[PDB]
Write a protein that binds this ligand. Sequence first.
Ligand code: HEM
Ligand code: PXI
Length: 391
Amino acid sequence: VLDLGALGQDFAADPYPTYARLRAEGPAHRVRTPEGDEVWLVVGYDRARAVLADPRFSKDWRNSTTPLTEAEAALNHNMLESDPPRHTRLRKLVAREFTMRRVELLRPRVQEIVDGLVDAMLAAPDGRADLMESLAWPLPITVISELLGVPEPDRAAFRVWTDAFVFPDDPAQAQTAMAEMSGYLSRLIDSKRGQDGEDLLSALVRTSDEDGSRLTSEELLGMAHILLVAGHETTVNLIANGMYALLSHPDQLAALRADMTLLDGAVEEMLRYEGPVESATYRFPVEPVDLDGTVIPAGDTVLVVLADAHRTPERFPDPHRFDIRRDTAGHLAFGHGIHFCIGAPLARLEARIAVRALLERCPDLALDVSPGELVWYPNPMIRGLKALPIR
Ligand code: HEM
Ligand SMILES: CC[C@H]1OC(=O)[C@H](C)[C@@H](O[C@H]2O[C@@H](C)C[C@@H](N(C)C)[C@@H]2O)[C@@H](C)C[C@H](C)C(=O)/C=C/[C@H]1C
């Protein structure tokens, strides 16, 4: 047992040793998260990678001996929290809207938002600004909002809720933020029906209305929620976490500026080295699972620590080395198996474009604060900074 909460900001800023110390003992460990959830952690690449796809580990709450709260039960009917055949049917509804080829068509607009964002930051008569506030946050929400059909003004709200799901001002703020969001979503869905809108939310509504067995109303709400939540802090932290590593490793920042053909690889290294998903979402085994002699009971919550698999020397030689030229093949930053991130092409698209943009423009690009003054979130599921001042 370990109370990651008790560990404090020290564990949050650098949780890797802890996960590593555990990986040296066994492949699974019962811990208590900063908020207070008692779960099992799966560490070590091979085991992490295997568990992720393993059919034995279900993502359907019906298989969790720890039941959903009321607020959460309004949102669990989504592809990420289901197993086939439901997962299969639900992902097929949006699969075509997220392929590399369809996403690429968004380049002009994505490239467009970044330029504007970067032009404003540079206007800073201080040569100093927060890259989190100026680019990392604005971009993700703007892109997804236009795609689905979430009004510009309602986007702040999501910043607040998403904040609460990761770190609530109390074990209640999370549950209340879910409720508020679940109510916003439903109302927005209502406002869309019969309006002949062309945005993706409008399409999904029509589909639900065409065949409720194809997409139930509780799945229509679940779908909307998952497409807007699953990629929010994740994409935002990929960008903040990616620029930071590069900024904290000038050797690599110089490498990319000098050779832009390293872009896609450097982003892959970012995902690897400091991806925003520290631990994958809840899995619940359908039956007892002996792992190296460690048996997790059926129905227990399990978090696969992607961060620890990404620092497993065996798989990634010299894992603590941020190297934008390293063979990343195999990283699990976007997951592994049937649940592989559907938004990966778009996320990559946004990160790749914003990264280059900054490297090109920003002449004397550098961290404008001591790493020690940086603050991270305790949550073992998401790796992200509260701020990232640059100059
Ligand atoms: C840097 C950003 C991102 C990262 C690193 C990331 C990471 C992940 C991870 C690790 C999974 C699987 C989790 C598990 O198996 O427990 C996943 C699933 C998912 N992601 Fe992403 N994601 C990112 C961006 C996005 C974006 C931009 C969207 C939407 C456009 C998105 C939508 C989803 C959805 C719908 C799922 C569930 C897929 C399924 O259950 O089959 N993601 N993502
Ligand atoms: C896909 C990887 C990221 O996970 C998420 O976006 C998860 C799914 C999301 O989790 C929960 O959000 C609640 C509002 C509903 C709940 N479910 C019980 C209905 C759903 O599982 C994040 C909000 C959770 C964490 C805090 C996060 O910010 C992102 C984590 C990534 C691993």
